[PDB]
């Protein structure tokens, strides 16, 4: 009920000539678009990637980004020139733009910039501004970008109008990939611990969607408090993976079960006995 839309741009600048920009677009944790540097056009990665935009609107949109990609390149190269020898190559720039939806006719948009892996600049209201912690030299770049009235107008439109309007289309066009259920499959394994007399039990859980999941080692009705659940890891077919580990005495593996809970099972848990 609370989906975030993220346009993520990655730009690398090796030196005064070499550069690349690739971006990917997400809606929650599903990928909607890809745009490799090596491609003239934006690639859809879902049948519903266009949401409820018409061709003329998409063509037009894709056109302005094409122009942006080239423009953005020359711009950074030129800011470097303005700031050097203060700041110099290699340079990494990342952008995260998009908006978040709320179950009213409600939304908030963001557009954040990182420089060398650090969040430094955002667009806010009608201008770019620096965030707390940013280095003061960025003021010149900002003063400059802010001088460009046409760009600010364009960026306001994108964040205030276009993006929400776009996404609400996507959310309707895309339900049932979004609301899809994929059942987890679980299996058990065991490894020696760095302790000189112990055993680490691992409960692998893979293939489930959406993300929310509950995995716990049980001895009957008893939840084993020492369960360490791992990070959520992606699969290539857009499902998730996760495991949970428990440290055990050698010879206390007796009668333990890993228990899995997920929306997809319809409330018949997976219980796997050792």
């Amino acid at each position: 009920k609370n989906y975030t839309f993220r346009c993520l741009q990655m730009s690398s600048f090796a030196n005064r000539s070499w550069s690349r920009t690739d971006s990917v677009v997400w809606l929650g944790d599903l990928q909607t678009h890809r745009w490799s540097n090596d491609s003239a056009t934006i690639s859809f990665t879902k049948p519903w990637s266009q949401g409820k935009l018409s061709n003329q609107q998409w063509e037009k949109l894709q056109h302005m980004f094409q122009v942006y990609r080239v423009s953005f390149t020359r711009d950074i190269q030129e800011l470097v020139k303005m700031m050097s020898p203060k700041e110099d190559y290699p340079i990494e720039i990342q952008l995260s733009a998009g908006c978040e939806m709320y179950p009213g006719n409600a939304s908030e948009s963001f557009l954040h910039v990182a420089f060398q892996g650090k969040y430094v600049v955002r667009f806010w209201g009608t201008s770019w501004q620096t965030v707390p912690g940013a280095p003061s030299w960025l003021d010149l770049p900002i003063k400059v970008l802010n001088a460009d009235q046409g760009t600010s107008a364009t960026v306001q439109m994108l964040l205030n109008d276009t993006c929400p309007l776009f996404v609400r289309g996507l959310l309707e066009a895309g339900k049932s990939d979004l609301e899809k259920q994929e059942k987890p499959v679980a299996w058990l394994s065991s490894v020696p611990s760095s302790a000189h007399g112990h055993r680490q039990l691992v409960c692998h859980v893979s293939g489930f969607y959406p993300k929310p999941v509950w995995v716990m080692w049980m001895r009957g009705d008893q939840e084993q408090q020492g369960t360490h659940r791992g990070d959520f890891l992606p699969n290539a077919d857009e499902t998730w993976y996760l495991q949970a580990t428990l440290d055990v005495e050698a010879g206390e593996e007796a009668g333990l079960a890993c228990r899995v809970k997920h929306s997809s099972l319809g409330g018949q848990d997976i219980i796997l006995y050792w």
Partner: T-cell receptor
Amino acid sequence: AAVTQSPRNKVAVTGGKVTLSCNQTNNHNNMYWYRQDTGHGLRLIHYSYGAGSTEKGDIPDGYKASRPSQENFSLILELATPSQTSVYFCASGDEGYTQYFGPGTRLLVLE
Amino acid sequence: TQVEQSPQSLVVRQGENCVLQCNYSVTPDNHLRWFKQDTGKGLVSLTVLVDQKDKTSNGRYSATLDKDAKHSTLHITATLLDDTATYICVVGDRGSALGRLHFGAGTQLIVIP
């Protein structure tokens, strides 16, 4: 809000060193050197984003640039050739898109 | 280059109207500026056009911009002798100093007194 150039008019010999100066008191960061030849728009040679900075433009060969200060931007011809006979415009500007142009410098190089 | 002007030159009698065309392929096209240069002298800015379909006036000079057509015109009402000059179309590709100026080769105008 204006820019001066010196000299207005220069007669050099092939293989001479020539310095065309440009001076502005607008406190602009950015100065630009162009040349004008009949049948052509102005073409950028070198430019600058501040004292200490010089940057190649479209046709930099045969020229070096110098920005010793906020105020001053020079174009230097270490070895003049007849092909550098031209009228030379300097300009300056702040963060905005407007560039303010000097009155120009008519230069002639001779054998 | 990326900015074409037309005509290359023209001769008009004092008091007559004339119109000057400019056509370009500069991308992006933030703004377009028209300059008057007298023989010998430097560049005097006449007017700058910024909008998608802009129109500007300044004394006896008026101008239009169509960014779709990437086309501008400069009208002069009731020419005077001092209009004898070269008129230059300039397209700028940013709304800031990060931009480069794209110069037309100009249009020479002679006014017969």
